[PDB]
Amino acid sequence: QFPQLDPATLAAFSAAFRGELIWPSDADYDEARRIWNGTIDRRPALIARCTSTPDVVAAVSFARKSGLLVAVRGGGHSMAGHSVCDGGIVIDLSLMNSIKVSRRLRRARAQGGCLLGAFDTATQAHMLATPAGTVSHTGLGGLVLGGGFGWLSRKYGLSIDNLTSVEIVTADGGVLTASDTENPDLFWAVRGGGGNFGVVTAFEFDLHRVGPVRFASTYYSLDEGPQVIRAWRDHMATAPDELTWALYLRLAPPLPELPADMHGKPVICAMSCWIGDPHEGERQLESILHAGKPHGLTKATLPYRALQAYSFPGAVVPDRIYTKSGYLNELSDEATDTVLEHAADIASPFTQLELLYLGGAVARVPDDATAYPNRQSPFVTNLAAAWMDPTEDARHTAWAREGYRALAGHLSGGYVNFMNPGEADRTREAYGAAKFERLQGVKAKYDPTNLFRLNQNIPP
Numbered sequence: 288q289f290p291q292l293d294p295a296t297l298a299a300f301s302a303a304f305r306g307e308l309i310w311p312s313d314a315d316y317d318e319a320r321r322i323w324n325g326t327i328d329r330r331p332a333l334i335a336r337c338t339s340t341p342d343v344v345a346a347v348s349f350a351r352k353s354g355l356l357v358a359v360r361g362g363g364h365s366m367a368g369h370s371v372c373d374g375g376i377v378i379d380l381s382l383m384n385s386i387k388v389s390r391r392l393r394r395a396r397a398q399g400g401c402l403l404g405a406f407d408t409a410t411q412a413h414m415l416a417t418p419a420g421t422v423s424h425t426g427l428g429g430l431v432l433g434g435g436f437g438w439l440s441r442k443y444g445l446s447i448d449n450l451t452s453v454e455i456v457t458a459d460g461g462v463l464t465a466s467d468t469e470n471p472d473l474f475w476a477v478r479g480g481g482g483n484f485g486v487v488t489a490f491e492f493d494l495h496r497v498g499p500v501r502f503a504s505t506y507y508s509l510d511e512g513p514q515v516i517r518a519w520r521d522h523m524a525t526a527p528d529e530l531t532w533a534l535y536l537r538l539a540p541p542l543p544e545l546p547a548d549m550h551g552k553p554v555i556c557a558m559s560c561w562i563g564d565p566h567e568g569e570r571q572l573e574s575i576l577h578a579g580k581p582h583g584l585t586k587a588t589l590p591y592r593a594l595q596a597y598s599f600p601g602a603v604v605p606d607r608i609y610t611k612s613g614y615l616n617e618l619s620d621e622a623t624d625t626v627l628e629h630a631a632d633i634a635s636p637f638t639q640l641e642l643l644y645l646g647g648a649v650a651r652v653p654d655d656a657t658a659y660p661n662r663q664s665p666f667v668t669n670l671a672a673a674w675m676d677p678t679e680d681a682r683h684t685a686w687a688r689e690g691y692r693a694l695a696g697h698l699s700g701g702y703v704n705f706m707n708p709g710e711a712d713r714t715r716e717a718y719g720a721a722k723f724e725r726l727q728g729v730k731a732k733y734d735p736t737n738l739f740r741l742n743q744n745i746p747p
């Protein structure tokens with residue numbers, strides 16, 4: 288964290304850098320190096336809080352010339368801890384939060400450090416939206432470059448399926464535009480290939496009109512686990528794009544809507560919504576709400592921005608997390624039973640075994656159209672352990688590991704944006720031989736020195 292820096296190279300950097308630099312001796316250094324995954328404790332030599340594209344140019348070129356290991360940071364939610372490093376530079380984008388929306392053209396230009404909630408707020412000023420993740424403080428930058436799915440995804444695709452161009456700062460310090468008509472090889476790679484190919488300082492999106500959303504959440508006893516998941520699995524195979532339905536197995540929150548008898552016990556929290564007319568959605572949601580007997584049932588007509596802000600109503604921000612995720616082509620009765628066995632052993636009130644159904648518009652993009660793999664797998668299982676006590680790491684990590692291992696045989700692929708710090712190994716398997724090979728050629732061209740290796744890495 289104290290390498291010798293050449294005063295010449297450093298001087299040129301600050302002359303060209305209009306941002307704020309955070310050094311290990313500064314008082315805000317310890318807070319600035321913390322990311323969402325609180326198990327990641329790392330001490331960069333320097334934190335560069337970039338405020339503009341020229342700032343990112345200055346920082347990238349200062350890292351290349353100085354040979355510093357490069358962490359790039361959007362919203363900080365890397366479950367692998369990629370957005371902070373030991374001994375290098377954090378290229379921090381969090382201050383680059385500015386959005387422009389044209390309601391007439393249904394387009395949004397968003398800087399590379401935006402949080403989802405800032406994006407959704409800006410577009411919803413005009414009743415517009417585009418798919419993103421379900422938790423507002425997730426960074427738009429990392430989420431999009433991995434694909435990005437959420438409430439709107441079954442209707443309007445992944446985030447990358449609404450992305451029309453990017454401004455990206457490559458390792459040599461140049462600034463490029465990547466679109467379907469300009470460096471289209473790089474535009475294929477950034478739509479699914481992570482931060483491997485440069486620092487995206489601006490995303491441009493197509494927008495869709497999204498009015499009020501009929502929404503429901505409820506909790507089921509696990510005694511009805513088998514019926515519920517089986518009805519969930521069977522129904523989403525032929526469900527319309529407009530219905531999104533998700534299962535979150537977890538300890539029941541000690542909330543008033545819920546009988547105190549269920550507090551602190553493993554339950555299925557089913558959340559659903561209808562991206563369409565709210566009268567149709569009311570009928571549609573009631574059709575899928577009694578696969579089991581629903582407790583703490585809350586139904587609401589929400590502005591889309593409120594739906595985006597809903598997940599999840601927790602009492603405490605979890606400090607420590609560990610993830611194991613994977614896709615499934617099918618969810619058999621045998622996998623359902625294993626999912627239910629391991630859900631019953633959930634110990635922390637912050638931990639969720641998530642069961643998602645993508646499909647819809649996601650699965651109708653041709654496989655090779657983006658670098659995002661597994662479009663044809665509809666199911667996503669995510670063993671998402673979360674806790675507070677650093678002395679309980681082993682217990683919560685062991686729950687996700689053994690849950691993943693008993694589901695291994697059914698798992699068919701992995702989402703790069705759910706990889707944990709010990710899963711660099713999984714990269715080529717995750718993308719598949721054909722996609723990986725094309726990504727390596729784009730890397731060889733755009734980042735031959737692998738300047739950007741703090742990601743699900745693709746070596747050139």
Ligand SMILES: Cc1cc2nc3c(=O)[nH]c(=O)nc-3n(C[C@H](O)[C@H](O)[C@H](O)COP(=O)(O)OP(=O)(O)OC[C@H]3O[C@@H](n4cnc5c(N)ncnc54)[C@H](O)[C@@H]3O)c2cc1C
Pocket residue numbers: 322323358359360361362363364365366368369370380399400419420421422424425426427428429430431432433434435436437481482483485486487488704705741742743
């Ligand atoms: C609580 C939580 C909820 C989530 N919900 C969803 C969800 O609903 N749907 C979904 O699809 N995913 C979801 N994710 C996963 C999310 O997409 C990834 O964790 C993503 O990497 C987070 O982006 P970030 O910028 O916040 O993370 P960071 O730690 O800042 O960055 C993650 C990676 O992206 C790179 N990166 C970030 N910004 C840029 C940029 N501008 N240019 C180049 N590289 C960049 C970083 O170098 C790093 O490798 C969730 C994650 C968390 C922790």
